[PDB]
Design a protein around this ligand. Structure first.
Ligand SMILES: *C(=O)/C=C/c1ccc(O)cc1
Length: 124
């Protein structure tokens, strides 16, 4: 159905969803493993960044796809959350690698499932 960016139970709703439903979301959604490998990447995220979802699946988000996120403010918070088991943070960021610099809001949250973490993205 509809689900709003930043919803308190977003991870419960998205646990229900297959690839096609994820492509129906109003915001960008990326699912990562604990090493930052890309497990899912939806159509809305591709609309923001110009990346073909089919070609980024399996690549490492912090090393290869999104080097500008390798920073204490983004990757640093991700690794702290993976280690502590409590990842749930929202912040503003700029995506500027091989693209027009684009201001975004990012929400990172642990999934329901084992060894999975979401990055949600919306333009601001
Ligand atoms: C900075 O390098 C960010 C790059 C980026 C962010 C999000 C994406 O889905 C793809 C590339």
């Amino acid at each position: 159905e509809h689900v709003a960016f930043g919803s308190e139970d977003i991870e419960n709703t998205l646990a229900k969803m297959d690839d096609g439903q994820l492509d129906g979301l109003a915001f960008g959604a990326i699912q990562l493993d604990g090493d930052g490998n890309i497990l899912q990447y939806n159509a809305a995220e591709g609309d923001i960044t110009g990346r073909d979802p089919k070609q980024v699946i399996g690549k490492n988000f912090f090393k290869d796809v999104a080097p500008c996120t390798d920073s204490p403010e983004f990757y640093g918070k991700f690794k702290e959350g993976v280690a502590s088991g409590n990842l749930n943070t929202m912040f503003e960021y700029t995506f500027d690698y091989q693209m027009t610099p684009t201001k975004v809001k990012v929400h990172m949250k642990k999934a329901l499932s084992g060894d999975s973490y979401w990055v949600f993205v919306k333009r601001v």
